[PDB]
């Protein structure tokens, strides 16, 4: 009888690595979509187009505008909520959206507790390692009415990790 520690990915950014555990047991579709886009190089070259100190940093848009991106299936998909998955700590990873069931590819990472998002945005991950990298991202000189970082900071490429207990 073996154990499966599940899948996780490491975001290789211009300012460091961020390792994210992906809750594939709870949010299956969100999990497969994230892993698939990650493997297709979809996020390679993506910048964090909106960084709000104390709130969250958002990315996942190839176009870099703020209204781009889509799912591996090429069509927005349903939300996946769980009463045990909440924006209660610094480092939760969730899917941005424009209302119920409009999940595509954009996602964000919280800089702290953000209870008003619970049950409104699908949380599918958590930063397990590389918290340092999050601090660098937060204290980044940004615009002021757009929060667009002054200097572009990208996600160079992504490493997918398999079951740690294989």
């Amino acid at each position: 009888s073996r154990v499966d520690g599940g899948m996780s990915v490491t975001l290789h950014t211009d300012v460091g690595d961020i390792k994210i555990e992906v809750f594939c047991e709870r949010t299956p579709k969100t999990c497969e979509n994230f892993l698939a886009l990650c493997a297709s190089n979809y996020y390679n070259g993506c910048i964090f187009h909106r960084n709000i100190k104390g709130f969250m940093v958002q990315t996942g848009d190839p176009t870099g505008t703020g209204r781009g991106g889509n799912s591996i299936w090429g069509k927005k998909f349903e939300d996946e909520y769980s009463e045990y998955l909440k924006h209660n700590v610094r480092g939760v990873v969730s899917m941005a959206n424009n209302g119920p069931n409009t999940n595509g590819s954009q996602f964000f990472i919280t800089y702290g507790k953000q209870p008003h998002l619970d049950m409104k945005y699908t949380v599918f991950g958590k930063v397990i390692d590389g918290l340092e990298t999050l601090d660098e991202l937060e204290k980044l000189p940004v615009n002021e009415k757009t929060y667009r970082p002054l200097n572009d900071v990208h996600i160079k490429d992504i490493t997918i990790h398999a079951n740690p207990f294989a």
Binding site: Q58, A96, N97, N98, T102, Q106, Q114
Partner: peptide, 11 residues
Amino acid sequence: XLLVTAGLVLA
């Protein structure tokens, strides 16, 4: 306010 949308950014 503090929302995470994709396109129409609101307050």
